[PDB]
Structure 1
Amino acid sequence: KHSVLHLVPVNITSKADSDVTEVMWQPVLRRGRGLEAQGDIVRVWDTGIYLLYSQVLFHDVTFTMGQVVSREGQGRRETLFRCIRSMPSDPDRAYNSCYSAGVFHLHQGDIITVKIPRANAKLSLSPHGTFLGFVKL
């Protein structure tokens, strides 16, 4: 039976003079031990091929938002995929979700990140609006 992990937000973080916002994740479903949430990143322990999906629900008013999913490993940062979505100007209509997913080879030791490249991004903590998960294939 395949290893899987579905994660939802506990809170959002944004370092001082960075222009980055990330999510502190918590597991709500887990089978197997190939994956482990460790705060705002997810560590891979079992080398192999994984379906990886990300949704973020944005409430920002700025031109465009979108999250970047990348894998740190082997001295590199590699971008796996990115979701881009344009935002309305009207602020009471800023409720837009961005879903992307793909299949990628991950090695044990790799760190997976989900970054939104603005500071203090207005991201929903709602577990059904913003989430992240994994299925070993």
Structure 2
Amino acid sequence: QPAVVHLQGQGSAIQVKNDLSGGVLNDWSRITMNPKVFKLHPRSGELEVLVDGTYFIYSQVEVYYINFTDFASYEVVVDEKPFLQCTRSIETGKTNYNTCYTAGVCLLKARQKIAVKMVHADISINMSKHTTFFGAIRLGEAP
């Protein structure tokens, strides 16, 4: 049947400006990854596809601290090029627990790198396994 994948935050909270490489979340946990269709690159945090198809991609990030912005925002990048975007206005300078979810569907080609990228630098993200996750589902054949 269809192949799915559900990555999770492995535990501790991160600082985008220090713990990340270009705002890309890389601390993932392959809990229910199908090996026939998906391949995760741990150091980069890219979800690579192996089969050309139609993919429903979902993601959620828990942002709790921001400096110099008035709003937190992230992109679901398809080969370092934006597809979806989730933005949330958050009180700047103080702790604000907010999970930010975005999902969409698009046609993909094999060996395609999908990633979660924060547009701002001064963000504190809680990489919890229940508040931060990244997933994809091969629905079927590409029209």
Distance 1:86 1:103 in 2: 25
Distance 1:52 1:79 in 2: 13
Q: What does residue 27 of structure 2 align with?
A: 24
Unaligned segments of structure 1, at least 5 residues: none
Does residue 64 of the first structure (1) align with residue 67 of the second (2)? Answer: no
Deviations 1:81-106 (A, max 9, x none): 000000024624x1011101000111
Deviations 1:4-45 (A, max 9, x none): 000012365324xx5x35232121112352111111111111
TM-score (normalised: structure 1): 0.84
Distance 1:67 1:32, change over 3 A: same
Structure 1 stretches of 4+ with a deviation exceeding 4 A read: none
Q: How many residue pairs are counted as aligned between the two chains?
A: 129
Coordinate RMSD, CA, aligned: 1.9
Q: What code does the residue aligned with 1:3 have?
A: A
Corresponding residue to 1:14 among 15, 20, 25 = 20
Distance 1:120 1:126 in 2: 19
Indicate conservation of the 8 Å contact 1:21/1:117, yes or no. Answer: no
Distance 1:85 1:38 in 2: 28
Corresponding residue to 1:125 among 127, 130, 134 = 127
TM-score (normalised: structure 2): 0.81
Q: Counting strand residues as a fraction of each chain, which structure ranks higher? A: 1
Identity %: 27
Q: What does residue 104 of structure 1 align with?
A: 106
Tell me how far 1:71 sits from its aligned partner.
0.9
Q: What code does the residue aligned with 1:60 have?
A: Y
